[PDB]
């Protein structure tokens, strides 16, 4: 080589200033920061812009995203909202492949029966063009 070589590893670290998605409860499918850590299966969270109050919660009920930014250790609510907007965490979230596939099935759920009939006709037109091109 001759300089070593280790693979090595890559995890999502739980920390102060780690934005997370909420699975269940009154929130469900929102976003919030981690303000300060308590212990192992326990953490404080807040995200007043997206709409979620201040609460202690299990890390099993929440889930870590791959997005982070600088926050003071153990901040309040209004100070987090100042940093939230400046970094542009909401805009970075929408462009991700996770959020687009989340937003896709929400649109699929709200389809009317007339709209579903158009998906038959438009998709049949694509198949004819693709099948002709692949043959050559």
């Amino acid at each position: 080589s001759t300089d070593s070589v280790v693979k090595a590893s890559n995890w999502r670290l739980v920390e102060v200033g780690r934005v997370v998605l909420v699975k269940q409860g009154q929130s469900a499918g929102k976003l919030a920061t981690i303000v300060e850590i308590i212990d192992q299966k326990r953490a404080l969270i807040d995200g007043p812009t997206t709409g979620v109050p201040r609460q202690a919660i299990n890390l099993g009920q929440v889930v870590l995203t791959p997005l982070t930014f600088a926050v003071p250790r153990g901040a309040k609510s209004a100070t987090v909202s100042k940093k939230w907007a400046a970094a542009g965490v909401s805009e970075k979230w929408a462009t991700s492949s996770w959020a687009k596939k989340i937003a896709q099935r929400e649109r699929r759920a709200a389809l009317s029966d007339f709209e579903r009939f158009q998906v038959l006709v438009l998709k049949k037109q694509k198949r004819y063009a693709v099948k002709k091109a692949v043959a050559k």
Binding site: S1, T2, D3, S4, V5, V6, K7, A8, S9, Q40
Partner: protein, 191 residues
């Protein structure tokens, strides 16, 4: 209480290297190469500054953190072996009957053979393991030395010579005979 994170730091010499994916550790150096599969442990490695590795555990226990420190010792012995090499000496304490030792070949296997041990007619036979040379000592008589890279294979081979020269049905404090280990260390001197 479960330790939230514990870690130990390896220090690699100049010439040697280490190649780690999953838990397979191919060490190479001046003398040769060695390998070891640690696929029963759940640790994680991190390269820092070429000649420095950090082994660590995340949320262990009392029993799990014991295996953290032992892996530091296991990998260090491969680096110590591949740089210098280990050397285990042996002596045969004989009282009445003089013990003979030879190395006769058979299908490229190489067996260490022992005869006339405590007046026995049965010719005894201990095999030589992979990657360890058997040699006789000049100047010092009544001696045999085992040398190689792997500390595990050399020490095991030296033990099998000792434990196939036991006395049976006698009082062992009286009949003080066998092939005992005198010294165990390194090949390269001044270290």
């Amino acid at each position: 209480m479960k330790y939230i994170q514990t870690d130990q730091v390896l220090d690699v010499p100049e010439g040697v290297t280490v190649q780690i994916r999953s838990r397979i550790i191919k060490v190479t150096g001046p003398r040769g190469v060695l390998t070891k599969n640690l696929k029963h442990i759940d640790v994680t490695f991190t390269k820092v500054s070429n000649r420095q590795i950090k082994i660590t555990v995340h949320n262990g226990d009392r029993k799990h953190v014991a295996a953290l420190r032992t892996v530091k010792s296991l990998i260090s012995n491969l680096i110590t072996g591949v740089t210098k090499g280990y050397k285990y000496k042996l002596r045969y304490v004989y009282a009445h009957f003089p013990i003979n030792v030879n190395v006769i070949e058979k299908d490229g296997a190489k067996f260490i053979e022992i005869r006339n041990f405590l007046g026995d007619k049965k010719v005894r036979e201990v095999p030589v393991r992979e990657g360890v040379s058997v040699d006789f000592s000049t100047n010092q008589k009544d001696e045999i030395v085992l040398s190689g890279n792997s500390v595990e294979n050399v020490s095991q081979n030296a033990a099998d010579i000792q434990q196939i020269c036991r006395v049976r049905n006698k009082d062992i404090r009286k009949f003080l005979d066998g092939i005992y280990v005198s010294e165990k260390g390194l090949i390269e001197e001044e270290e």
